[PDB]
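Internal ticket #5521
Category: modeling
Description: The requester needs a full-assembly model to guide mutagenesis choices. All entity lines are attached below as received. Residue total reported by intake: 1190.
Assigned to: D.W.
Attached entities:
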Amino acid sequence: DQMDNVNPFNHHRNWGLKYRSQLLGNSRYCRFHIQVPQKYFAIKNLLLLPGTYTYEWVLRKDPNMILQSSLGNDLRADGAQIVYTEVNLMANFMPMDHNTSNQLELMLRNATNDQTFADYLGAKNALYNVPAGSTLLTINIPARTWEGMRGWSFTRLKASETPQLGAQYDVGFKYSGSIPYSDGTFYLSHTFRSMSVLFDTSINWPGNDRLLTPNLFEIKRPVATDSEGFTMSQCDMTKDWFLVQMATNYNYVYNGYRFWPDRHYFHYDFLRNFDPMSRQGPNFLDTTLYDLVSSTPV
Amino acid sequence: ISSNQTVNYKKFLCDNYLWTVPFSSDFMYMGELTDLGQNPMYTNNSHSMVINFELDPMDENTYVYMLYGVFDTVRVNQPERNVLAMAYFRTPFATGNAV
Amino acid sequence: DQMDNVNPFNHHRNWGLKYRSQLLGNSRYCRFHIQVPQKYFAIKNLLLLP
Amino acid sequence: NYNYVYNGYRFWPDRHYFHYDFLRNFDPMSRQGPNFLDTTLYDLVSSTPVVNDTGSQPSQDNVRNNSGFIAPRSWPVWTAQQGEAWPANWPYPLIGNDAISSNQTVNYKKFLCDNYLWTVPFSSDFMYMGELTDLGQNPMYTNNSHSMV
Amino acid sequence: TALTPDLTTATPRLQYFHIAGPGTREYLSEDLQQFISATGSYFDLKNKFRQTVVAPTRNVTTEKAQRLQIRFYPIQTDDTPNSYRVRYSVNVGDSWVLD
Amino acid sequence: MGATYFDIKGVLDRGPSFKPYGGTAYNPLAPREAIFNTWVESTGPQTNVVGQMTNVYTNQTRNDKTATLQQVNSISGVVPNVNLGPGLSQLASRADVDNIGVVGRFAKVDSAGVKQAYGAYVKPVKDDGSQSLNQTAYWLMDNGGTNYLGALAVEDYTQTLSYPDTVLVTPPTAYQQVNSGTMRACRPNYIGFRDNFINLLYHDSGVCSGTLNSERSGMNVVVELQDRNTELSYQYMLADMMSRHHYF
Amino acid sequence: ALWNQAVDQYDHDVRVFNNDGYEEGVPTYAFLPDGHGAGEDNGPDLSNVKIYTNGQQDKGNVVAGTVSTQLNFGTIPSYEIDIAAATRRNFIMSNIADYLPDKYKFSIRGFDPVTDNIDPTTYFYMNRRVPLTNVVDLFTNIGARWSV
Amino acid sequence: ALWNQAVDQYDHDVRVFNNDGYEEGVPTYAFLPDGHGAGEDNGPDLSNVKIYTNGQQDKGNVVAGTVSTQLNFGTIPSYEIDIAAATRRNFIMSNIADY
């Protein structure tokens, strides 16, 4: 229990970090060299035609950005140091015949066929720092047009374990661990309760007595068993919420409750990463029923 | 024996994933953008919105990072050798800028 | 040899039984709740009308 | 191999990677100076065989060293556990607070490969388009013979 | 911005940015098409033109509040020492359908 | 642009906390016991009203202590005063410096504070392990009043003890003496990067927003926002087309 | 099993040595067992004494009933063993070490008929030539992936 | 976990006993710990003696300062335990035996 809430990933047996932390060396010092690509949503698949095109990008240095740690502590406090000897831009061309070539551009340079690139995540990013005790979190959005809107994908995340993007750096981040806001090492997500959606303050979405509680999809029932009724799965999940991460998900639900073959279940999955727990009274209950109960520290 | 029998502390777990409601009717996936998005009562006169939450006591300062999804699309128009331009568009939220 | 013939499954390391024997509790006593389906060969896929 | 290359540098799904594969059996290594460099930079460097490892190979220093708790001193014997619980001098620390190949550690970069072969492709683009090659089909290999080395 | 036009980022929009209209074959250069397939056996390009999905926004789902799920309460229980019979009753909404 | 990577190549110390192994560095066996130094167990004088003129008479304010706990080792022949010879050639083969017959070398007092064994490093000084400032001392307790011939031969000298990757808990005392603060088995840490070099290149930082762009019309056509999570996308799009559980 | 299909393969961890070194937590000891009613061996004897005396205020007195018991001026015997590496050492010391080329090993002084008619391709020598302990143990490039 | 789907299965190695026996390398012993400043228990005492005497050429002499120290005429205590099988024995002796 006294562990649910910390970044596991930032563990020592993270076999990956145990891995990537070697193609360099077991000496705090590595005369390295590497080939890092880009991923900017709008070019990764671009295929430019004949005639030069200027180019400029930038590397970062903050050791609590470009460097991971098992224990996860800024390597600046212990000034880790990186220094780019030299860098270039390699490029592998395609020995495309010439007539042929003269053809693709002849074509690629068409209006009809203007390429385009859409981003996988597909969404905006907003950041509402909650207090540090607060329980509800009111996000009154303003007015505007919501045409095209897919929906809401959302998970909580530490404060210290997430940075505020913008300038070169941020003389405040002192952490070498992980950024689920950048790896999805989310672990602070099932700490959610309710989630009310209000359009125009008068109408609710979805409303239409859809959930056995439609004024807010429910995600769980208070500690002391109260909603054992709308619990479900043998976990705190409500027979309501299970049917969402099970709807917008594997299109399995309105007539079958099976584990859509993991073939549709790799990482950011809902089923496999879905873990259901259960445990009895570790003091054998408080001082009430159990006639001779007690507490004992260290 | 918790008087009669043991009490039960029922909890569940979830990591490496997110949460996602689907702006839709049936809850399932039929299209990239939603029959909900396509919708004229979201096409017609604008609106407004407020989503509230009820987090579980959080030790230190923490955030949320909310994910609103829309096509962050684009295009690429190569006209004449050496010479370019990247169109640009996303919606909802087409680079919301207003004084 | 003196083992070929007994129900292995009914073993202790049957990781499944080691598993299913917990979504309940390590206390011989569980204030449970569950969702059990049916499987009767002739309905599991039936879709009844109005 | 995986006809992946002229416009994408990803691990073609292992579905095309069973045994005699190039990617999975492809192993990339890396290691620093195991004598902390030769006698040049590192101001106080050295070599130590067996009849001198400061205690068996587990000459492990900054701890109970090793000596006497395992085999004894005598060269390669590996039998009884005789010895003197005395501190060692090797393996110099190459991290912690101590350690530094003048400025920082030297780098011995090697890679690995097993269960596979090597294969150039008698071709133009390097990728696989046909069983026999546009190169084979070729008349300058069809025409007057040749030779090779 | 409480300010928005009853038609911002419409049709021509979902149009230009391959967010709608025709899939890549219904819009790609007829000859562009050939080669695309005529060399894809070794030159990946099967993306650089996305064929936006889309969904039907008519006669599928309901408008009037219905019931995605219903919890039925028994009518004729009847416990014993080794059995547990349970008489439930279930209706199928006129214009409602179950599996 | 699928064929265009930024070819890094440079230097970088991991700092001082890169512990690429598990717990203990050096010795991992032998317990949290010690090596064999100089036994100096004694409280010592005090600072109270004692040695005066006629005020109060003082007894004895002395209690020297220079013993040395240790353990014999190797075996040799006789142990006279001329050290000892573990062999015999054309004459008395005086044992080597790094090792002299029976028993062995021992940590001296000059050693900045004493620590236990499971925490002990001292960098070498001869291609065969050996330091300097070596002093000997013979032993013989059974003084019956006949033979004064010893049996042991200790080689006490100071070493370069320390502990770059070893930290303990509560030492025997606070005073800096020959006790045993012995810091040990530090916590392991692997310093590296993130899958698919997340971070590395500034993305979504208008200020440090990249810049592809033509010359003929030189208008930059790449302009990130602070909502275009870039990292998270790619790492999302990868498990998808292939198990992110890959090791490219 | 039909087509005796069973490709040949080693143990990952062994070929390409992977050295986190090992890791231990609490020094776990073995302790003097002693059937049951015991637990500790080294321990003197002490008699049950009281003070309640008929004629004495501050002083003790011995009773009459028990004049022998087993106990100790310390605790109970033990001997640390950092399993963590022990097996490790018993791991390099048996998967690569003893699997090295006789060209970096060495025969032992005290063989009987080894090499007498045997060579380095015959069990005898093959499995009678000591390796070089000091060549690949626990603290060997540790923290770095470096298949010997 | 919903459909309590969790097929029943044993431990490979157990049903069909596979016996390489086990394998051990160096007899690893546990040794008398002794807080720290020690390591060895069984050991006599010896005083620091010298020879430099003012009037004697070949003979030793005792000093004045130390007359008690802990050491030994051997090494340091131990007890072999071939883990390799121990666990094994503690493996048959608990997966098939007792089953």
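Resolution: model delivered.
Comment from assignee: Chains C and F do not touch (no CB pair under 8 Å).
Ticket closed.
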